[PDB]
Design a protein around this ligand. Structure first.
Ligand SMILES: *[C@@H]1O[C@H](CO)[C@@H](O[C@@H]2O[C@H](CO)[C@@H](O)[C@H](O)[C@H]2NC(C)=O)[C@H](O)[C@H]1NC(C)=O
Ligand SMILES: *[C@@H]1O[C@H](CO)[C@@H](O[C@@H]2O[C@H](CO)[C@@H](O)[C@H](O)[C@H]2NC(C)=O)[C@H](O)[C@H]1NC(C)=O
Ligand SMILES: *[C@H]1O[C@H](CO)[C@@H](O)[C@H](O)[C@H]1NC(C)=O
Ligand SMILES: *[C@H]1O[C@H](CO)[C@@H](O)[C@H](O)[C@H]1NC(C)=O
Ligand SMILES: [Ca+2]
Ligand SMILES: [Ca+2]
Lengths: 482, 482
């Protein structure tokens, strides 16, 4: 019997935000305990530093450029989305007899009649927002009870963020100081129903937590010590605790695999209300470590022994790994990941030796921006980001334009994870690594062909989810609070 | 019966170097275990970001400017040193019937006939170097076995670093790839002798570890994964393990208080061979967090319960704390520290509410550079440092000159520990904190009077420790290897 898989996916969380990663003010007890009793990756990566492309890779196990998930991210009125021809991790597990369920952020397309929503991609049940919770006006929305408004006002001229139950609206806009609870209830029911049916479950919990605007329930409002960002993180942390308690009540601890990760680096433009990359450089939107190296925790009593691993792992590896753990056969399409089960179970080492990073806005001429092989990371092209502004490092700012590098900036991450000292700024070891890194790039650029841009398919405001069909005057008239 | 006190003092170690503090490549098993089974401070500080002044504060529990321990640091031919009129933590414990012993770096003066050496300051036994191990030519010295030279060549035109046994030379220069062992042996004997005499011991272990040049024994050479700096840290870590094993063999675990800390931030000019401040800003030589906030661990089974504390603590508090734990009466002189025993034992909170930081080169006109009260830290004067060069942040570089600030740069460390967002760049809470921080500064500048500069007393090459008295041609002729 395959194990119960619980996949927690954080939004805009940095490498140095969790307590178990050394943050001085963060409050993350549950996550610290999960790490204390399980594997903790120090070198877990994501191919792209943005929500849409990153998530596209997690579910499909393939580089975002293949399925046209570029450039940037999808908006509410986007005409495209994650292709149906694509096979998600939910689809492979469902065929294996898994009760699949997703709670939270999707951001992988909505399309016409909701053709791109979770129910059509392999999930049995679904409760959450079709995209980032800031993609819709929030001037009047309350982020912290009793009545503390969400700063910034969010994306204007849009229909309020809808809380969809499968394919139909449940609220619009939902009550943020209580949206988390709805997810936990949904999660507990999914597991309970799965238990009584003698059927394994799969909970993809894509939290809105630590993405702007920062929100929370009265239970965490001003309780972290790190302010708004802290309270939001404390809620995400508590959500992990409740899921563990629920699994504990059902007596599934040793029969359930829990995994925690985030989609991309910290949005430092949010300043004190944003995440922290720690010692790593830059953040969200950039190909620097701070934006692509995400925290990761593997928990599974009696199977995954507690410790810390410095071995190379990526979000592209989850699908094949989970498929191997569930006995579910891998899809026909070429995956860009590996089976990390040996590493998790402790029977061997990780088969991942190289990592490829693409920019927020890729093209077939420049190709991959950075490649890592072993402890060496080359930067063929560097670029800053608006998401990584307000930092002391000028390289992260939007001011820093796309500059090419020949020879590339070579960094030894084992002794310089902060990417401060360029080696080629020679040694037989270094020189050999260079020729290797240059060849790996050329090989991928030659093989990988960019799939048709889904984002370039245009926008149509008629695709915006409205609570009252044939409403007037749209989109403001689309309403149905709690 | 008072507890056995073991004080491990690291040299040039950053806030983000230990594994338990989130470093991706560091290997520090013993220290990670010590933290896992004891208190771990997230807000432990030092008044000055340099070796000499910092150490002067640890032993005396008073601000370095009081006893004239400025400016900069002491050199081998320095005419001055830590005043004998000063009462060290070794002196108060010795009177309480403690077998005191120091192993490692002193850097608190040597003087004429060695009038400033440890034996005259309260230590019964002593084995170590009178100052930084880089203060003397190292072109020919081997840092890593079998025959790997120390890079940089160190301070030229000086007598080789002497390994003193109390007041007399034992080696010059000593074998670095084996200097650590001599310290451990000395430590084990000190504890053993103390045990049989039914007398409590006090081991001040001031390691040379993570200070340049990086050295190690064959046991750790290329075994950390972080290179030279890593190997050096791995040895320091192992040294902690052996001291614990020794205490375990004597069955003193619950009767011995172990404390680990460092004197100042990472010397980032050493680049990949230097420390890491983590998410904190800048490093050694600066008043920024990266240079004054040091890691700290309190271990004591059955007394100090494992956990993490965000409460304010300083190296200035150790003397009064240890004196309270040993029942030893505090000296007549005014201490700038507090008794942290309630915090350690868990019977109460830390009495420390404010922290004052002085620059590498202070003066009575400008006074304190930065003051912290609660979660707010004000910067009345900012300055970079050569020790903090080669970083991406321009504020740390030596290029950044001493600039005044009116109103001061106000930072909320609870939500901005990286000191990126100046609040005064207003709010009743903030505005009230400002007037408070401004008053605290003015009060200290008015009260504290700078003691006569010991460093300004001049240099005399005749004070250099020579193995062969009346040698020729000095100082090169002063030799006695192992
Ligand atoms: C999404 O839709 C499915 C049906 O397509 C719902 O599943 C049923 O849910 C009820 C409880 O509400 C169970 O008693 C049924 O056994 C479920 N049927 C199946 C086939 O699983 C699901 O609850 C819906 N979820 C949301 C959040 O709307
Ligand atoms: C420093 O000097 C003291 C004496 O002033 C030494 O202490 C004696 O050491 C021997 C062992 O070598 C013991 O048997 C004696 O009992 C010790 N006497 C006292 C009064 O403690 C000490 O060993 C010397 N240490 C170094 C490193 O030179
Ligand atoms: C709140 O104000 C905004 C404009 O600032 C407007 O878009 C929204 O409809 C208003 N809603 C309510 C409930 O007042
Ligand atoms: C080694 O060379 C240095 C000069 O580079 C000199 O100071 C030292 O005395 C020499 N020692 C030996 C043992 O060769
Ligand atoms: Ca994201
Ligand atoms: Ca030092």
């Amino acid at each position: 019997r395959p194990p119960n898989i619980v996949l927690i996916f954080a939004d805009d969380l940095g490498y140095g935000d969790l307590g178990c990663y050394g943050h001085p003010s963060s409050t993350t007890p549950n996550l610290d305990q999960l790490a204390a009793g399980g594997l903790r990756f120090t070198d877990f990566y994501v191919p792209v530093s943005l929500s849409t492309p990153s998530r596209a890779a997690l579910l499909t196990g393939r580089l975002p450029v293949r399925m046209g998930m570029y450039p940037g991210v999808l908006v509410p009125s986007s005409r495209g989305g994650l292709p149906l021809e694509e096979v998600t991790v939910a689809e492979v597990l469902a065929a294996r007899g898994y009760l699949t369920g997703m709670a939270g952020k999707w951001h992988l397309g909505v399309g016409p009649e909701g053709a791109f929503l979770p129910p059509h991609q392999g999930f049995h049940r679904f409760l959450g927002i079709p995209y980032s919770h800031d993609q819709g006006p929030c001037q009047n929305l309350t982020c912290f009870p009793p009545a503390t408004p969400c700063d910034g006002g969010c994306d204007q001229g849009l229909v309020p963020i809808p809380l969809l139950a499968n394919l139909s609206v449940e609220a619009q806009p939902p009550w943020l100081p209580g949206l988390e609870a709805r997810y936990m209830a949904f999660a507990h029911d999914l597991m309970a129903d799965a238990q009584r049916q003698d059927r394994p479950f799969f909970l993809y919990y894509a939290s809105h937590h630590t993405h702007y605007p920062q929100f929370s329930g009265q239970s965490f409002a001003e309780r972290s010590g790190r302010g708004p960002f802290g309270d939001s993180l404390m809620e995400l942390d508590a959500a992990v605790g409740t899921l563990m308690t629920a699994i504990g009540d059902l007596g599934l601890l040793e029969e359930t695999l829990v995994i925690f990760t985030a989609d991309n680096g910290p949005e430092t433009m949010r300043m004190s209300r944003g995440g922290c990359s720690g010692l790593l450089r830059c953040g969200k939107g950039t190909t620097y470590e701070g934006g692509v190296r995400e925290p990761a925790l593997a928990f599974w009593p009696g199977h995954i022994a507690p410790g810390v691993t410095h071995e190379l792992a990526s979000s592209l590896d989850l699908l094949p790994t989970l498929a191997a753990l569930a006995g579910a056969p891998l899809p026909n399409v070429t995956l860009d990941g590996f089976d990390l089960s040996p590493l998790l179970l402790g029977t061997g080492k990780s088969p991942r030796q190289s990592l490829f990073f693409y920019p927020s806005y890729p093209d077939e001429v420049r190709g991959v921006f950075a490649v890592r092989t072993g402890k060496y990371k080359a930067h063929f092209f560097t670029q800053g980001s608006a998401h990584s502004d307000t930092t002391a490092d000028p390289a992260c700012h939007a001011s820093s334009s796309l500059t090419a590098h020949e020879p590339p900036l070579l960094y030894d991450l084992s002794k310089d994870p902060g990417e401060n000292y360029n080696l080629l700024g020679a040694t037989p070891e270094v020189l050999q690594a260079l020729k290797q890194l240059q060849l790996l790039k050329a090989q991928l650029d030659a093989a990988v062909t960019f799939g048709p841009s889904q984002v370039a398919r245009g926008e149509d405001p008629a695709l915006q989810i409205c609570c009252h069909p044939g409403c007037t005057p749209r989109p403001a008239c689309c309403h149905c609070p709690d």
